[model samples]
Target chain A: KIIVKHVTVIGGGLMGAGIAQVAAATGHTVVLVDQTEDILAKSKKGIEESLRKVAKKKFAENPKAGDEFVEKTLSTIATSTDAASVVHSTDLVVEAIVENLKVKNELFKRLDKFAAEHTIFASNTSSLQITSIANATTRQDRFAGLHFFNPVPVMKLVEVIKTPMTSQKTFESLVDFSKALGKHPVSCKDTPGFIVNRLLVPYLMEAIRLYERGDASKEDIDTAMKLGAGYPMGPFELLDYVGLDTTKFIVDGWHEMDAENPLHQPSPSLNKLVAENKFGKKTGEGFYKYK
Target chain B: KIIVKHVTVIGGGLMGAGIAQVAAATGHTVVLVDQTEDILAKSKKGIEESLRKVAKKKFAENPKAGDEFVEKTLSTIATSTDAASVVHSTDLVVEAIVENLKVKNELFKRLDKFAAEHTIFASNTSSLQITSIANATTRQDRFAGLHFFNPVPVMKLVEVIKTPMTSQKTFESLVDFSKALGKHPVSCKDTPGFIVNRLLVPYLMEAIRLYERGDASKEDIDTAMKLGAGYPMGPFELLDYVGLDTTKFIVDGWHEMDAENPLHQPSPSLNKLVAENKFGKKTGEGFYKYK
Candidate 1:
């Protein structure tokens, strides 16, 4: 059994920072590693700001609890540019690094060489072959995917992925680790998007197809889904929120793998919009043109 | 344009009561018609109880607002055993009569003769053919499907289904009516399960297949989707909630229609359960045996 007292989160991007913040807040001694000192500094600032917001919410309930949360979180988190140094001392090394398979595999190869044999190795990968990532590491039994949604602190779900080679003990340990962080963990087979996005992405892409065909106006489709289906946001609205380019990429990836699934085929309109750089909220325009 | 001032909801089952309650609450005078006087009485009593619950919750917030809701709901609802009488006086006749095509068609045929040509005809039939129901009337343009989810007052979506015969004007009128009732109206092609169910049913069925394959226990699969996907309920739990027989029948219906869609093929486990009369929550058993 792994007593995951120390966690090292590699990368300082959105997913990386958000994850490090969650681990730090939950009282784990966390090492947030990035490629450079400047990036590490930025991520630390982001985590601090996020932790303060949580502190205010926590403190509003009880001042002492809030103060304790702030102190523990601030004291628990340590940042570094040295990946090898971070992995050497940690009980679990969770990689939220770049999504590139080569880059990820390369990082895991290095981490495997430096970390202790019993150290749990997990990847916060959304869509990648966990087996491939695990194979890159010598500790394949300890390898699993810990897929968290965007804005990790707010989203309650964490898909604990079990590749074919992953040991049952490692899976259970990851589940317990997730629960300890006050997050709900569910197990998934190593499938694309693991669970939520696999189903959600296709539905979203189909909704876009419906829009492109003029089957309905964007407003009506959004209204239809929101009102008609009780979905928090309609497909196009969700696409806008998810970024059109990301939506296209996800669908394109699936299509590239299996073009027979009617739902996976990319909408030309979506691709055209992506080509035009109307990538959604990030670019201030997309399906409905966000302000 | 149809005013839909007086609406008659046939049958006093869950779907009927929900439709009547929501329509009545939204200021439409509703005639909740049923076959047996006993069932009609029970349905009205149930509606009254739900109204009181709503009133109580509202009153907890504001007594004046609660009183207004109570007064408005009670004044607008009436009960009837005479289907013809109920049909003749209403501007819109939404039949939640039964899932039987023959029974629904016969009811509408009678309604067609008694009601005005302008009376918007609709069926709350979740599975039956809306086109067949429309064929029972001369004014095919006025006929459509207003497929509402069970416990209708709470579930926000109302799928506005259009057959080839349905006019754009009639579709728009139903959309307006649904909007007036503060229900989200999603216009869907006359496909299986319309919108939410079309995409949702296959996904749920796939979850069942995963369970049947012995890849995971039903409890684990349910937990996975609920915890992993943040679904309100897992597939088996929802299958049980929706009744195994109903689920089997729906899937079987799709299989009968399009056998090529491998996802629609009924599972032998589901078939065996339905055959064993393990109809689910209704029977206190199915995938799970409820006490």
Candidate 2:
């Protein structure tokens, strides 16, 4: 019965801003919070630029209406330096902060004291279990994981992850909110990688191992997957795009959690690339080089 | 310098017929050989219908040209019941028969004595070891794996696998041949699954394992991959499309090959479905019922 129209998204990073932009664009009042006012300003600026692109695409024939659409969406979003200052007035809190467990638990612990009794909480963390983060707050029944893919306006998937403590009503509220944003919602339990990453990360690593063993060149492997399996991009192309360092971190963490799992075993080539600070396309050098 | 202009394709199944059609259409004189004349007749009929569909799309501008295209392509293809009798005139032999190692070896062993020393031999087997198949023939220097995907005329990739014994010239000849037929060729060392299936099969099995562990429903998992990861199809849907029995056979073979590797571990749900004769789209049922 609870309708979530007022949403507070913490950490004004790429993901946080994306989530806030889509929420505001879809008619929700979104409060985008960061640790500093400077970061918050940058986030709001980025969101405006993103909205402009969306407006251009959605209302291509009407340029005047497109400008109006951007203005109205940007007007719905407000910036805050502190999450606790806004949680009391919000119906939902979405944490898109860093992936550190201790830092997230600390943030949730503070928000738990200030949030209203019925306010639902969700984390946008692709890694880290939802249960561990939820355990930090007293409102476990209202806690869940609402994971959105990157470039939120473009990608349409939002994973609604439910822990054992999450109530059915709380779960349904998040699902309804996602649908309201014009996104498709899929349900999953509180597990590592949930669904996409759990299946995807290991496959990426296996592709790396295959390359390391000299089974095939990176270009050939990429070409084979794209042409043979009908994948939009090959595994190596995805790893490079996702950032090799990011992929290594996920694999390392999983390896620590389960050393016996061959699938989780770290790749030497990936480790060497990270050591060299070749963080894929961002660094201009990874498994392959870029200009 | 070893050009493959005269080719004999063993087996008149979907894969062989398609290969022969493409080779003939591209101006290569193709001899499609099979065990029986009736099976060969059916394969030729299927090839003609497939060519009609391709012609409609490719020659949409000129209906007269399309008919000529089909007729000229069909004229270049010759059918034979005995492969050994035709081996003397052919420059290459591409085996696409049943996936039995013994039968493949027997065919190659006989062809080795009949074929010219310069003629290269290749198998389109996706599962078996190319090295083992090549060992049956005295011409290991001319033996390699020339793997083509299903609906060979449509799929653009062909994995040309090389054993250590295969001469570089022999490997290059097949690569050139693939290009001659308007197909892209990828090089892979003689390893299990070559490149595509080496990475793909395990990933598909992992998707099944994720479902078996109760992480998410199949429909949700399918939607997540398509929406979140940009996969063409979800794992379960792909399992059904690829045939549950085919996937199970690959996993089972890998499991027997390497008992210690967990990636090859068979899925109970997959085994159960196949046990009930649910071979996916080919059958009426698999992970889900098909109309």
Candidate 3:
């Protein structure tokens, strides 16, 4: 059994900080690492903001306790810039680095050489192959995927992806780790998009295809998905929220991987939007013009 | 513009009562029709119970005002055992009878003969064809589908389906009617299961196929869907809730219509369980036994 005493979360970006906060909140000592001191400070501030939102939304019944909860979680986290300090002392190390495979491998290669033998290495890459990331580690059997959703504290889900090389014991220990962090864990093979995004993204794209066909208006389609299908957000609105460039990249990635999958076929409108650099709310326009 | 001033809702069951309630709630005078006085009374009770829930949930901030909303909504509904009174004065008539086409056609035949010259007819069917039900009406241009989701008072969506014969004005009016009743309306063609079930049901069945293949346990499949995908409920859990018999019937109906749709292919395990009358949660046996 992998006894997770202290955990290190590398790359203090949105995903990394959220993961670290959750782990720290659950009583695990967490070292949050970033390349620069400024980035690490920004991540710390972001985690504080995130924790405050969660405390209000989820634990509002007891405001005093909720504030204490945030403080306690923050106390368990230490911010650092040194890679060796982040990798060597922790029971497990989770890399939530930039999506570039080569950069991710380089980081993992360093960890493999420096970290203790029993330290479980993991990657938080949503779309990349866990096997490729695992190969960078010396103890491939202990490497796995601990993918968390956006706005991690509020969204109570963590995906435990098992690569071919991931040991069953490692997988089980990660499951326990997720439970201890008060997050729901579900296991899956290291397939593309895992469960939610695999089905959801394609379905959203199909909804876009319907609009492109002139069968329905954007307003009508959005209304249909929200009202007709009981979706929380309409596809058009979500497309704007999730950047058009990112959307294009995801669809393109899947299409390149498997041409036969009709779901991955990109819409002409999506391509046009991406070409224009109207990458959703981030860049001002996409399926629907955002304010 | 098609102005829907009067509506007649046939078959005073749970669905019929909800339909009638929504119509009446939106300020349209409604005629609720059933075969027996007992059924009509039950429908009235169901409407009252639903209104109470809606009032409690929607106007929880002001309990006194909630009672007023319920009282106003309930007062607009009228009940009848006789078909002639219900049909003769209405501008729009909705049938929510048993899923038997013959019974529905017979009901529409009487409405066609007895109702006013410009009565717009519709079906609240989740499975059956809107065109087939409209066959009994002389004014096919005014016929369409007004499919509402279950627990109508709580769910904010309605799928307004249009057959080829349905006029644009009639469709627009149905959209207006749904909106006036505080529902989000989405339009679709007269295709099988319209949109939600057409996509969702097949996906649910595919999860069942995985279970049958021994790819994963039922619990794991459910956990993956619930926690991993953020679905309100898991596939097997949903299959059980939406009776196994209903799932089989829907798939069988679609397959019988067109055999080439790969998604419509029935699972042997589902067929076997349905054949044995192990219907699901209602019968206390399915993928996972329930209390």
Candidate 4:
């Protein structure tokens, strides 16, 4: 029933900075927490740069108002090295840290002892189980997953995930918070990959298998799906764009949980690429080479 | 090395008529063969209307030329009840008949004996094995699959499929033929569902499973993919638009061929709808009602 007016985002990476920027822009006071002063300063700089671009177009007619809007949003976001120091007063804590179950569990467990009883906990994890992370906290009813896509300000969809123990009020609050931050929210159970990644990741994996089997050349397969099925990008091109290492990590994790599912079985070619550190566009080599 | 000039198309259905229209419009003499005069006349009417629509835009600057183009294209196409009688002089034969393997084999086997040695044989079969169909003829090197999407004039993709026995020359000719018809061609080996369907069908099947499992509502799941992943249409909407019967038939065929693959397993919900005669948009009722 309470509105999430104060948001504390833990992590100063691309996803974390974007989330914090959007939250502050939408009129919420945000505390962006990282491990050190240098990382926190960099996150703040990224948020300021992103806000200026958004304000440029949003308030183009009133140049003075645009400057004020950027300044106001930036002023609301404070940087902190210690998460617990800020957790006691925050209404929501969104974790966009590294995708390790043990690290996430440790962070949430420590925060649970310091945060207010009504403060909601959410993770921005794309592949890990939300229930297992929530199990580490005493307030299971208040814990949920708030998975956002990369470059959070631009991508509109957010998966408001609920484990079996997540209360309806908590789930609804998370959904409302997403909308308040100017994003579309879709409800999903705490299942593997949730909704988008659940369907998409496997589809990308299958394209790899098709190419590996010598059924079609990578270029032709990409062309066929783009023109034939009206996909925005070919699966191979997408795999490269979204790092091969990330794709392998998701598939390998799922395969670990469900080895018999052919959808999760890792592609030998993809594994080889990841092993060689050719993680697609980021590394300039994957299914195709890029300069 | 040889170009397809005079063509023989054995069928008078939607796909057959569309292929005949495009071939004739693009300056190829076409013989559209069917079982009876009544069906042949219907196919002719369909082609005439389609040509008129095309001419309206293509020759809009010269109304007189538009009329001439339609009439000239119509003149290039001829109707025949006997495929074997018309096969002797044609440079190419494209079979777009019912999806029954036995029926297609019988028709091609008879035509192979009557057709010229240089004539290339291609099937517009979407799911059937091109190799198995090629088996009925001794000219396996000349036979290949030219799988076109529905509404052939509008959909730009054509999968030019070649079996192991198909000569490189045959494959090149098919690719060239597709280009000549103004369709983008993608080369695929003679595999189940070729390129697009191989990846797409399994994705659709997984979406169905997710809905059936109650991990998310169908509408929410559809919304998630469209917004989160940038798909042109939601899976359920596409399933309804593409017809449940057709989806079931494709999945069922794959299941028959590879029963061990869970991706090919039929959804009980889809099978029940097909049994109830709720084929999808064609029947006005499917996952969602049309009228």
In CAPRI terms, where does candidate 3 land? acceptable
Instruction: Give lDDT tens digits, candidate 3, residues A171-209.
Output: 988999988988888887787776666656776787777
Model 4 TM-score?
0.87
Best by TM-score: 2
Report the CAPRI category for model 2: medium
Residue range A48-121, candidate 4, lDDT tens digits: 88888888898989999999998998998999999999999999999988777888999999999999989999
Docking class of 1: acceptable
| Tens digit per residue, CA lDDT, model 1, B1-291 | 766788988887777888999899998889888988898888888888888788887688888888788778867888889778767667888888646667788888888998876788998876667887899888798999998875687788788999999999899989999898888777777765665665566766777766666656677666655654445677788788767776776787778888887658889998999999998886889989999
Model 4 residue B156 lDDT?
A: 90
Each candidate's TM vs. the true structure? 0.84, 0.91, 0.80, 0.87
- Model 1 misplacement above 4 A: A35-42, A61-75, A163-169, A188-198, A237-291, B61-76, B100-103, B127-132, B161-176, B184-193, B242-253, B272-291
Candidate 4, pairs of clashing residues: none
Show model 2 residue runs off by greater than 4 Å: A41-49, A52-56, A275-277, A282-291, B275-277, B283-285, B288-291
Docking quality band of candidate 4, CAPRI definitions: medium
Q: What is the interface RMSD of each candidate, in Å?
A: 3.3, 1.0, 2.8, 1.1
User: In candidate 1, which residue pairs get closer than 3 Å at backbone N, Cα or C atoms, i.e. clash?
Assistant: A227-B184
Least lDDT summed over 10 consecutive residues: which range in candidate 2 chain A? Answer: A241-250
Find the 10 residues in a row with the least total lDDT in model 3 chain B.
B224-233
Question: Between candidates 1 and 3, which one is better according to TM-score?
Answer: 1
The lDDT-based order of candidates, best leading, equals 2, 4, 3, 1
Encode model 1's per-residue lDDT on A201-261: one tens digit a residue: 7667666656666556677667755654445667777777666776676677677778897
Assess candidate 2 and give its TM-score to the true structure.
0.91
